[PDB]
Amino acid sequence: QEDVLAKELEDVNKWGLHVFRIAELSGNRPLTVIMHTIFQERDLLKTFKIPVDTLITYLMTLEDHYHADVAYHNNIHAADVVQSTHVLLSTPALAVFTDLEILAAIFASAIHDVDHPGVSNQFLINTNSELALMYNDSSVLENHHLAVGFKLLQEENCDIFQNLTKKQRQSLRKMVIDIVLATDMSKHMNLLADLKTMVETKKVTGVLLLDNYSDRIQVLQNMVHCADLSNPTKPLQLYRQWTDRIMEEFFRQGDRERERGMEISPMCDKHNASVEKSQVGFIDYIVHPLWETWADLVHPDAQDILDTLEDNREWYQSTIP
Amino acid sequence: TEQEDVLAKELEDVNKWGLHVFRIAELSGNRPLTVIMHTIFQERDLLKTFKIPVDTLITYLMTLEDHYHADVAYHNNIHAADVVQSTHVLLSTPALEAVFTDLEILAAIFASAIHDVDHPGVSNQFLINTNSELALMYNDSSVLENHHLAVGFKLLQEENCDIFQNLTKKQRQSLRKMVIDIVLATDMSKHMNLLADLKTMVETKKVTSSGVLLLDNYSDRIQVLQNMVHCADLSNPTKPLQLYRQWTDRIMEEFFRQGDRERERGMEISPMCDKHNASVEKSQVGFIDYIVHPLWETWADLVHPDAQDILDTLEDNREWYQSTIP
Ligand SMILES: CCOc1ccc(Cc2nccc3cc(OCC)c(OCC)cc23)cc1OCC
Ligand SMILES: CCOc1ccc(Cc2nccc3cc(OCC)c(OCC)cc23)cc1OCC
Ligand SMILES: [Mg+2]
Ligand SMILES: [Mg+2]
Ligand SMILES: [Zn+2]
Ligand SMILES: [Zn+2]
């Protein structure tokens, strides 16, 4: 078990990690064991004088604040985005980012969905939720994920940034905020349009050259956004499991919408939904346009992932009679 | 009841720039926001238009006024009533006659009332640098302005406080978005971008057959309402000098108290907050020259010449504060 886990973790730098096995192999603690192994792999514990214990105590209370009764936005999803951002950072076309910029993108991935109630922003807005009332209908979940993620650092022996300098702590906090706020799906088009102009003005050596903060944080934003939408790009046995979990969450929200008389938002109707046609449409309009633009920026480092994405699009299309 | 008759006489000037807002606060028993909002709602027939019960309106106004801190010198209920009344006058300008709907007028006035509720008397940067719970909650992004909105909307849920109870859900949805867009624009960190957009509108403004401004899209309509409440927020140097000087003494009192809290923490004292080495007169001249006059001169161009007397008072007050320096 512990040494099945040990050898499972050996592919942390591989696109297609067995995150679900690692989850059950780790006692439902995949976020803790993956974040740890990544910090040791990138040498972040020593580079930022992070006490190993304090890293454990925070990753556990951070994982506990992910809801276990939600099918998709739980600790397994947080672990999957963490590992995938870690792989996209090791892309040959980019140590383009500093050690703090790497730690910010990895830390933002771990907290990007903490305390997710399993419902969308529009649901929280239309139901007059306390969260939407607090955050004025603007990136309600993403603001909440950040607030909870930072507040847990103030708990007993969980300030993993205790020995960072004050200027590093503020620079990290600013970058983590800018990244997690970009995970709002309502900002996907603007984030992709700005990614398309970056590739239209790309300047490489061919390692890519970013000089100003607004260009580097823009790549980090699209990077974690790419890993947030990386399910259709992983192996099919992983993709299908994520599809079952996100549809189970959409149906649960659709059940809650119908028992209040609110409109059944698309892809949420129990009794009227085509899971396979929605996945093909989700790839053709969102995932593939984003991943093909990201492929052109690190051309040709993302060719394999774009191939796997096109493979799964073809397979899901074949499941449609 | 002679104090009620003096108050009713002073409330007759609510349509006029330079209302004795400090006297109204005294005559109404520290309730300027309630009586001024009630007077404006009656003046614009808002209670009948939106079926607002009078008891519900008074109950919410008192509750909203209660949540303004009485122990803060500037960002208190008097400032809220002042911004409400000054937005009310700016809405009645001739260049904007029949331009905004009753819902947009209701949104701008309501936004003015809640735009600073529960202000603790310290800036956004102070709340960010001190690792406050508010800055943690709102991730250092428009911390105060987001808090003002959340409190102003939350108080509507108290007993007999929903003044929007008879609006349609499409009306409440539209009003809520407009109020949020307006209050968020009161963040001074967005002043340069908001003024840049206002200058672009002035350079490309279109007028109608009647001579009023043509605003045929939400982006242009909300931009005018944003800058209007923003100008009302920074309206102190455009008021008669006896009112301007009182607002100056109150904001300097708030600045000095923040600098004292900045001193007791070893922090670097924010500008214009060190009560041991500060120049009140030179700061007001720089405040007018670099912020207030560029903003109000641009707004005056937008409704030329309806704001000429307001602009003349601002330039007169700038000259006076300048004359006290040599
Ligand atoms: C227009 C369609 O856009 C969207 C539609 C739905 C969503 C919702 C959404 N959020 C996060 C992850 C998601 C993963 C999913 O599949 C995993 C295999 C998924 O599968 C829909 C068929 C939808 C997902 C987000 C969208 O992004 C833009 C708002
Ligand atoms: C870009 C935004 O700039 C600024 C934003 C805020 C402030 C500080 C500030 N905040 C709110 C209200 C203020 C009212 C005042 O007086 C009324 C008579 C005032 O008087 C100068 C001391 C400063 C004020 C100062 C700024 O500019 C300094 C260069
Ligand atoms: Mg999310
Ligand atoms: Mg304010
Ligand atoms: Zn996510
Ligand atoms: Zn104000």
UniProtKB/Swiss-Prot annotation, chain A:
Compartments where found: Apical cell membrane; Cytoplasm; Membrane; Cytoplasm, Cytoskeleton
Occurrences of domain PDEase (ranges): 1-321
Tissue-wise expression: Expressed in colonic epithelial cells (at protein level). Widespread; most abundant in skeletal muscle.
Active-site residues, record numbering mapped to chain: 73
Effect seen on changing residue 113 to N: Decreased 3',5'-cyclic-AMP phosphodiesterase activity. Loss of Mg2(+)-binding
Residues reported in the UniProt entry to bind Zn(2+) 2: 113
Residues that hold Mg(2+) according to the record: 113
Residues noted as binding Mn(2+) in the record, renumbered to the chain: 113
PTM field: Long isoforms that share a conserved PKA phosphorylation site in the N-terminus are activated by PKA through phosphorylation. Isoform 3 and isoform 7 are activated by phosphorylation (in vitro), but not isoform 6.
Disulfide bonds: none
Domain of life: Eukaryota
Residues that coordinate or bind 3',5'-cyclic AMP: 73, 279, 282
Binding of AMP, residues: 73, 113, 228, 231, 279, 282
Residues annotated as binding Zn(2+) 1: 77, 112-113, 228
Disease: Genetic variations in PDE4D might be associated with susceptibility to stroke. PubMed:17006457 states that association with stroke has to be considered with caution. Acrodysostosis 2, with or without hormone resistance: A pleiotropic disorder characterized by skeletal, endocrine, and neurological abnormalities. Skeletal features include brachycephaly, midface hypoplasia with a small upturned nose, brachydactyly, and lumbar spinal stenosis. Endocrine abnormalities include hypothyroidism and hypogonadism in males and irregular menses in females. Developmental disability is a common finding but is variable in severity and can be associated with significant behavioral problems.
Function noted in UniProt: Hydrolyzes the second messenger cAMP, which is a key regulator of many important physiological processes.
Self-association state and partner proteins as the record states: Homodimer for the long isoforms. Isoforms with truncated N-termini are monomeric. Isoform 3 is part of a ternary complex containing PRKAR2A, PRKAR2B and AKAP9. Interacts with PDE4DIP. Identified in a complex composed of RYR1, PDE4D, PKA, FKBP1A and protein phosphatase 1 (PP1). Isoform 5, isoform N3 and isoform 12 bind RACK1 via their unique N-terminus. Binds ARRB2. Interacts (via N-terminal region) with SHANK2 (via proline-rich region); the interaction is increased in a PKA-dependent manner.
Family in the record: Belongs to the cyclic nucleotide phosphodiesterase family. PDE4 subfamily.
Protein name: 3',5'-cyclic-AMP phosphodiesterase 4D
The species this protein was found in: Homo sapiens (Human)
Upper lineage: Eukaryota, Metazoa, Chordata, Craniata, Vertebrata
Full protein: residues contained: 390 to 713 of 809
